[PDB]
């Protein structure tokens, strides 16, 4: 039998308490929604691979014990755990599978303790793991109802015990008890663990309450990548998809002969260090196993190549330098050690690939009387270049006097030999040393590894190897023209893109298997759980080739676009507004087609329209709307301060002393942050403090029907803000702050309190509603609000009579607009997006900065205190300085991002100051600057780290068609409108303003004369009153 594991196989990853924190783990877990085997144990009539999850819904504990091993047939030792009425017994012995086993020959571990096995049956969850000879048990008891097998119940397994088993385990089997042999039935559940990434949610009590399987479905993948159990509607860029290779191909030249390593390991007698022997070895196979153990060695230190990989490396040409050296000089053979022998006998290059083998030769070289046959030279005018020998035994004159002939006094000729004696040599003992040096991937390889060639495959991406050149990708016939000497094909990125087959003369291209970005398009996690997957710039004929979740790749619904191809959305012919942009004009939405589904479509750019253009047709509005629109502008951000000592070094004296050398970096960081904070105060001052005096609204708030109660401050509330200001303050939401403070990242309060910012705003409001634009220029001059409104009307080319003749209507429109602002602010939380996301950016930056402290930066650990406790200074300080460099780089990155963010905030604050100067302190003519339509005035409202402008705009509406003429010819002379336009209702002509239909009789004051009617194109005939 088989079934589905809904929420089983979760345990506490480690013995550590947490609280209200979403933690990502990567470890052995039972995958979510897995094929769990439902076993039945009946009397009337299992591989232990990568951990095992065992569940028992048993009553009266028939199932008792388990066995663990590789064969369980006394081929090696084995485990058994078994339990009975009072206790449990664990044994590690040579067991022949006490009916369970026959004999126990050699026993290594025994254990007795409290038993682990303690129709309303209960689930007794166990997790068994073994890693590096350590066997861990996790367990949990959950009493369950009589509903059905494996309910939707969730609970983690607390750790019980770990045992040092130290034994190869491949298979396990469980054990049953019988009370005879009465017939009966039982049942258990088996699951297999896999290396998976989980997200665990901790409650206030630190119990793992919920989990998300990141590598199960795209939705959970987005959940794991955002580290949240709820995902907002949109598109999220998840892990990259990669077509995995099929097999491995190795191609080598057909070389079978062995490299003569025999003569270099044991010759008649090795050439001396001054005349060290070299030969090129090539065109053979190199292996160390047969010959290394024959001449046993004591110093094998290798630099570029591990000894085990040397058999798996394919060479071009190799050299060995074999010579007799003094024992005590065995440590001079490493690159860069200098001395008499280094500068005059032998030296190897500082940067090379190769290593040395040294072993004893006293019993074969040393003589009782002294073996003075191995020459070594100490004296020469010039040093010895690496990999060079000199055999000129020219007389050397140490003294300043001239030295001629064969020898002379104060002349030290290069003739001295070793005093090698068998027993007297301890550190003076001769050592015969062979240094193997080689060059890889510079020339075509000849001396290659024992590894055998493989058959050549094409149009299937593979792990291809060509004479040590390793890559992965598809192989194709080459249109490039190689030459006999040419071996490799290089790209712009200095990465190999072509190969020559070492077996034949054929040349091949390289193209790694298809890949590209993966995006997940989801609605609100609350709204739905079905998602769409976009494969960016990938042909949808290749994702079937990519057939770890494969369920969506077999989808019944595929749509191809320029951005890539989409799976899980139905393409439609209809055009809607874009909500989730895909790219290249494709947008995704979620609606009913009666079932709900995700759809993809071509985004509409709005409703199609055709303007009724003609020779002489004009559209003049007859009505208006006083539209109040909110414009939100960030003005300042949270003034941040950082201490190097607290953040980088915590409270360590040693770290402080190692850091004070980087004082320049810390002073520049502090200077930059102080500049940013003073700039935030300057931003607030420039935006708000534009007024010399604090004005007060009069107690009699009579403004010709304009009721500013929702924007003027309310004395009733302690905080002297307005209704709209209070709503804005409540909408923006400002533990992790305590951790930020404890890690040395502090928030300096703004110079201006919210109360004084509100007082500045109230002064601006009072000045605007009582004086108008005058208080911006010089002394505030009082003026009735009606007259100010008439002036603002005159500003937008509307005659002031319009407002006075419609005063009550305009006042009611403004009041209803303020009501709509209140309703919109109270209802939706998406109103103050900009301020909220600015706060979120600052919070995310500080959270990222505090999370960087968990980074190791290549050190032993990310906590300095344990480094100091467990290490003496001489490497404690090098670990600390690496940690300091890492954290200082993190601080520099944070400060740079803060400088760029502060620059963008300063741009916003300059724009806000300009808007307060041009929209609040006056009427602006700049189109769409102070709101959509003809700007009349603006009202500032303080908001958390920003301002809100209530842009009052005139918007024409209820337009009507009219016949129009560019001019009027009355007495043979053209007439033009002084300030207006000519329109005809069908019988008579009238002059009217451009933004409000109001006809007037054509008289000599509405019109001015210019030239005659035989030049102007489109002039008409009418009469003009004197």
Ligand X SMILES: *[C@@H]1O[C@H](CO)[C@@H](O)[C@H](O)[C@H]1NC(C)=O
Ligand Y SMILES: *[C@@H]1O[C@H](CO)[C@@H](O[C@@H]2O[C@H](CO)[C@@H](O[C@H]3O[C@H](CO)[C@@H](O)[C@H](O)[C@@H]3O)[C@H](O)[C@H]2NC(C)=O)[C@H](O)[C@H]1NC(C)=O
Ligand Z SMILES: *[C@@H]1O[C@H](CO)[C@@H](O[C@@H]2O[C@H](CO)[C@@H](O)[C@H](O)[C@H]2NC(C)=O)[C@H](O)[C@H]1NC(C)=O
Q: Which residues here bind ligand Y, judged by CB under 6 A? A: 623, 707, 709-710, 809, 812-813
Site map (CB under 6 A) of ligand Z, residues 540-569, x = contact:
-x----------------------------
If the CB atoms of residues 103 and 338 are measured against ligand X, the closer one turns out to be 103
Pairing of strands 617-634, 507-511: unpaired
Question: How near is the Cβ of 560 to ligand Z at its closest, in Å?
Answer: 6
**DSSP secondary-structure letter at 422?**
T
Tokens standing for residue 667: 């002073």
Residue 892 binds to its own copies (criterion: CB under 8 A): yes
**DSSP secondary-structure letter at 410?**
T
If the CB atoms of residues 247 and 971 are measured against ligand Z, the closer one turns out to be 971
Question: How near is the Cβ of 371 to its own copies at its closest, in Å?
Answer: 39
Please report, for residues 247, 484, 677, the alpha-carbon distance to residue 464 in angstroms, rounded to integers and kept in the order given: 9, 21, 57
CA distance 874 to 150: 57
Tokens standing for residue 563: 């951005």
Residue 961 binds to ligand Z (criterion: CB under 6 A): yes
- The item of ligand Y, ligand Z, ligand X, none sharing an interface with residue 985, based on CB under 5 to 8 Å by kind, is ligand Z
Strands (E), 527-670: 532-536, 558-560, 564-567, 570-571, 580-583, 586-592, 596-602, 617-634, 640-642
| Residues with Cβ within 8 Å of residue 663, at least 6 apart in sequence | none
List for the chain the helix, strand, coil content (%; round to 5).
25, 30, 45
Exactly one of 123, 313, 521, 798 binds its own copies (CB under 8 A); which one?
Answer: 313
If the CB atoms of residues 110 and 875 are measured against its own copies, the closer one turns out to be 875
If the CB atoms of residues 176 and 619 are measured against ligand Z, the closer one turns out to be 619
Instruction: Look at residue 541 and give its three-state secondary structure.
Output: coil
- The item of ligand Z, ligand X, its own copies, none sharing an interface with residue 205, based on CB under 5 to 8 Å by kind, is ligand Z
Torsion angle, alpha carbons of 678, 683, 685, 691, to 10: 160
Exactly one of 180, 749, 778, 986 binds ligand Z (CB under 6 A); which one?
Answer: 986
Exactly one of 106, 119, 423, 573 binds ligand Z (CB under 6 A); which one?
Answer: 106
| Residues with Cβ within 8 Å of residue 670, at least 6 apart in sequence | 642, 644
Q: Angle at the Cα of 977 (from 975 to 979), degrees rounded to 5?
A: 155
Number of CB atoms found within 10 A of residue 261's CB: 19
Best CA proximity match to 634, nearest among 896, 839, 831, 917:
839
Exactly one of 102, 105, 470, 753 binds ligand Z (CB under 6 A); which one?
Answer: 105
Exactly one of 59, 309, 671, 925 binds its own copies (CB under 8 A); which one?
Answer: 309
Task: Candidates 635-643, 769-777, 835-843, 979-987: pick the segment binding ligand Z (CB under 6 A).
Answer: 979-987
| Phi, psi (deg, nearest 5) at residue 185 | -130, 145
Tokens standing for residue 260: 């003569």
Exactly one of 312, 506, 577, 959 binds ligand Z (CB under 6 A); which one?
Answer: 959
Question: Could you tell me how many residues make up the chain?
Answer: 1026
Question: How near is the Cβ of 179 to ligand X at its closest, in Å?
Answer: 12
Question: How near is the Cβ of 300 to its own copies at its closest, in Å?
Answer: 13
| Residues with Cβ within 8 Å of residue 695, at least 6 apart in sequence | 763, 766, 767, 770, 771, 775, 780
If the CB atoms of residues 467 and 942 are measured against ligand X, the closer one turns out to be 467
Best CA proximity match to 354, nearest among 278, 415, 418:
278
Question: How near is the Cβ of 606 to ligand Y at its closest, in Å?
Answer: 24
Question: How near is the Cβ of 969 to ligand Z at its closest, in Å?
Answer: 6
CA distance 434 to 44: 73
Please report which helix (H) or strand (E) contains residue 904, including its range.
helix 873-915
Instruction: Look at residue 202 and give its three-state secondary structure.
Output: strand
- The item of ligand X, ligand Z, its own copies, none sharing an interface with residue 911, based on CB under 5 to 8 Å by kind, is none
If the CB atoms of residues 227 and 490 are measured against its own copies, the closer one turns out to be 490
Edge-to-edge strand ranges of the sheet holding 34-42: 2-5, 34-42, 185-192, 52-56, 122-131, 134-143, 158-163
Question: How near is the Cβ of 796 to ligand Y at its closest, in Å?
Answer: 17
Exactly one of 183, 256, 987, 1026 binds ligand Z (CB under 6 A); which one?
Answer: 987
If the CB atoms of residues 39 and 303 are measured against its own copies, the closer one turns out to be 303
Footprint of its own copies on 433-462 (CB under 8 A): 440-441
Task: Candidates 60-68, 291-299, 415-423, 984-992: pick the segment binding ligand Z (CB under 6 A).
Answer: 984-992
If the CB atoms of residues 284 and 809 are measured against ligand Y, the closer one turns out to be 809
Pairing of strands 596-602, 570-571: parallel
Question: How near is the Cβ of 248 to its own copies at its closest, in Å?
Answer: 13
- The item of ligand X, ligand Y, ligand Z, none sharing an interface with residue 809, based on CB under 5 to 8 Å by kind, is ligand Y
If the CB atoms of residues 916 and 1002 are measured against ligand Z, the closer one turns out to be 1002
- The item of ligand Y, ligand Z, its own copies, none sharing an interface with residue 13, based on CB under 5 to 8 Å by kind, is none
| Phi, psi (deg, nearest 5) at residue 332 | -85, -10
Instruction: Look at residue 498 and give its three-state secondary structure.
Output: strand
Task: Candidates 654-662, 825-833, 903-911, 952-960: pick the segment binding its own copies (CB under 8 A).
Answer: 903-911
| Residues with Cβ within 8 Å of residue 828, at least 6 apart in sequence | none
Question: How near is the Cβ of 612 to ligand X at its closest, in Å?
Answer: 12
Query: Could you tell me if residue 585 is left (phi over 0), alpha (psi between -120 and 50 degrees) or otherwise beta?
Result: left
CA distance 199 to 60: 36
Q: What residues line the site for ligand X (CB under 6 A)? A: 2, 35, 84-87, 89, 230, 254, 503-504, 524, 526, 572-573, 615
Residue 889 binds to ligand Z (criterion: CB under 6 A): no
Asked if 419 and 442 count as a contact pair (C-beta separation under 8 A), the reply is: no
Task: Candidates 85-93, 323-331, 508-516, 893-901: pick the segment binding its own copies (CB under 8 A).
Answer: 893-901
Site map (CB under 8 A) of its own copies, residues 482-511, x = contact:
------------xx----------------
Best CA proximity match to 939, nearest among 831, 818, 774:
818
Radius of gyration of the chain from Cα atoms? 44
Footprint of its own copies on 867-886 (CB under 8 A): 869-872, 875, 881-882, 885
Question: How near is the Cβ of 378 to ligand Z at its closest, in Å?
Answer: 57
Q: Which residues bind ligand Z (CB under 6 A)?
A: 105-106, 203-205, 539, 541, 610, 612, 619, 959, 961, 985-988, 1020-1021
* Binding site residues, its own copies, CB under 8 A: 304-306, 308-309, 312-313, 353, 440-441, 468, 470-471, 494-495, 857-858, 860, 862-863, 865-866, 869-872, 875, 881-882, 885, 889, 892-893, 896-897, 899-900, 903-904, 906-907
């Amino acid at each position: 039998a088989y079934t589905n594991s809904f929420t089983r196989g979760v345990y506490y990853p480690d013995k550590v308490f947490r609280s209200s924190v979403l933690h990502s783990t990567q470890d052995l877990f039972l995958p979510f929604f897995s094929n769990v085997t439902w076993f039945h144990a009946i009397h009337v009539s299992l591989p232990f691979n990568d951990g095992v999850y065992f569940a028992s819904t048993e009553k009266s504990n028939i199932i008792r014990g388990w066995i663990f091993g590789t064969t369980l047939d006394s081929k090696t030792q084995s485990l058994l755990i078994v339990n009975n009425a009072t206790n449990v017994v664990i044994k590690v012995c040579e067991f022949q599978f006490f009916r369970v086993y026959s004999s126990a020959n050699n026993c290594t571990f025994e254990y007795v303790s409290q038993p682990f096995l303690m129709n309303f049956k209960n689930l007794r969850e166990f997790v068994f793991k073994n890693i590096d000879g350590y066997f861990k048990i996790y367990s949990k008891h959950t009493p369950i109802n009589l509903v059905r097998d494996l309910p939707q119940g969730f609970s983690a397994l607390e750790p019980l015990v770990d045992l040092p088993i130290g034994i190869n385990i491949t298979r396990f089997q469980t054990l049953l008890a019988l009370h005879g042999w009465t017939a009966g039935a039982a049942a258990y559940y088996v699951g297999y663990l896999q290396p998976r990434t989980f997200l665990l949610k901790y409650n206030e009590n630190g119990t793992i309450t919920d989990a998300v399987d990141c590598a199960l479905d795209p939705l959970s993948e987005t959940k794991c990548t955002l580290k949240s159990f709820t995902v907002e509607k949109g598109i999220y860029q998840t892990s990259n998809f990669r077509v995995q290779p099929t097999e491995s191909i190795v191609r080598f030249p057909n070389i079978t002969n062995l490299c003569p390593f025999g003569e270099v390991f044991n010759a008649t007698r090795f050439a001396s260090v001054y005349a060290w022997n070299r030969k090129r070895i090539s065109n053979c196979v190199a292996d160390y196993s047969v010959l290394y153990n024959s001449a046993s060695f004591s110093t094998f230190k290798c630099y570029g190549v591990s000894p085990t990989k040397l058999n798996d490396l394919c060479f071009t040409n190799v050299y060995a330098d074999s010579f007799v050296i003094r024992g005590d000089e065995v440590r001079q053979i490493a690159p860069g050690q200098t001395g008499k022998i280094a500068d005059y006998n032998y030296k190897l290059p500082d940067d090379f690939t190769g290593c040395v083998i040294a072993w004893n030769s006293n019993n074969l070289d040393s003589k009782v009387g002294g073996n003075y046959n191995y020459l070594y030279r100490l004296f020469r005018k010039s040093n010895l270049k690496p990999f060079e020998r000199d055999i000129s035994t020219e007389i050397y004159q140490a003294g300043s006097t001239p030295c001629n002939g064969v020898e002379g006094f104060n002349c030290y000729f290069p003739l001295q030999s070793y005093g090698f004696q068998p027993t007297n040599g301890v550190g003076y003992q001769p050592y015969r040393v062979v240094v193997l040096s080689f060059e890889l991937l510079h020339a075509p390889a000849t001396v290659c590894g024992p590894k055998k060639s493989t058959n050549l495959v094409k149009n299937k991406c593979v792990n291809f190897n060509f004479n040590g050149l390793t890559g992965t990708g598809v192989l194709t016939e080459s249109n490039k023209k190689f030459l006999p000497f040419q071996q490799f094909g290089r790209d712009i990125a200095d990465t190999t893109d072509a190969v020559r087959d070492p077996q034949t003369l054929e040349i091949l291209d390289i193209t790694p298997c298809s890949f590209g970005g993966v995006s997940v398009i989801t609605p609100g996690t609350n709204t739905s759980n079905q998602v769409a997957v976009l494969y960016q710039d990938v042909n949808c004929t290749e994702v079937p080739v990519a057939i770890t979740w494969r369920v969506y790749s077999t989808g019944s619904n595929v749509f191809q676009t320029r951005a890539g191809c989409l799976i899980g959305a139905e393409h439609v012919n209809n055009s809607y507004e874009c909500d989730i942009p895909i790219g290249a004009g494709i947008c995704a939405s979620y609606q009913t087609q009666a079932s709900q589904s995700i759809i993809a479509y071509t985004m509409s750019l709005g409703a199609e329209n055709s303007v009724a253009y003609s020779n002489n047709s004009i559209a003049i509005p007859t009505n208006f709307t006083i539209s109040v629109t909110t414009e939100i502008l960030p003005v300042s951000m949270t003034k941040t301060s950082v201490d190097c000592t607290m953040y980088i070094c915590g409270d360590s004296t040693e770290c402080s002393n190692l850091l004070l050398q980087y004082g320049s970096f810390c002073t520049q960081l502090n200077r930059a942050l102080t500049g940013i904070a003073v700039e935030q105060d300057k931003n607030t001052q420039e935006v708000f403090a534009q007024v010399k005096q604090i004005y007060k609204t009069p107690p009699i708030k009579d403004f010709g029907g304009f009721n500013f109660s929702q924007i003027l401050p309310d004395p009733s509330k302690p905080s002297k803000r307005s209704f709209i200001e209070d709503l804005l303050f409540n909408k923006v939401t400002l533990d992790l702050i305590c951790a930020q403070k404890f890690n040395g990242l502090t928030v300096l309060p703004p110079l201006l309190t919210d109360e004084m910012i509100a007082q500045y705003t109230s002064a601006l409001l009072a000045g605007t509603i009582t004086s108008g634009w005058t208080f911006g220029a010089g002394a505030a001059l009082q003026i009735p609000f009606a007259m100010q409104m008439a002036y603002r009307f005159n500003g937008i080319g509307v005659t002031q009579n319009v407002l006075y003749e419609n005063q009550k209507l305009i006042a009611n429109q403004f009041n209803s607009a303020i009501g709509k602002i209140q309703d919109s602010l109270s209802s939706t939380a998406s109103a103050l997006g900009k301020l909220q996301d600015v706060v979120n950016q600052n919070a995310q930056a500080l959270n990222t900065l505090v999370k960087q402290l968990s980074s190791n930066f290549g050190a032993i650990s990310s906590v300095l205190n344990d480094i100091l406790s467990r290490l003496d200074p001489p490497e404690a300080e090098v670990q600390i300085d690496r940690l300091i460099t890492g954290r200082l780089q993190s601080l520099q990155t944070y400060v740079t991002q803060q400088l760029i963010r502060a620059a963008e905030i300063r741009a916003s604050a300059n724009l806000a100051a300009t808007k307060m100067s041009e929209c609040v302190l006056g009427q602006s003519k700049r189109v769409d600057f102070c709101g959509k339509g003809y700007h009349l005035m603006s009202f500032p409202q303080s908001a958390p780290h920003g301002v809100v402008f209530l842009h009052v705009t005139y918007v024409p509406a209820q337009e009507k068609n009219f016949t129009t003429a560019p001019a009027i010819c009355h007495d043979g002379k053209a007439h033009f409108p002084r300030e207006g336009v000519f329109v005809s209702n069908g019988t008579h002509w009238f002059v009217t303003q451009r933004n409000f239909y109001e006809p007037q009789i054509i008289t000599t004051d509405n019109t001015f004369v210019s030239g005659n009617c035989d030049v102007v194109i489109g002039i008409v005939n009418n009469t003009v009153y004197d």
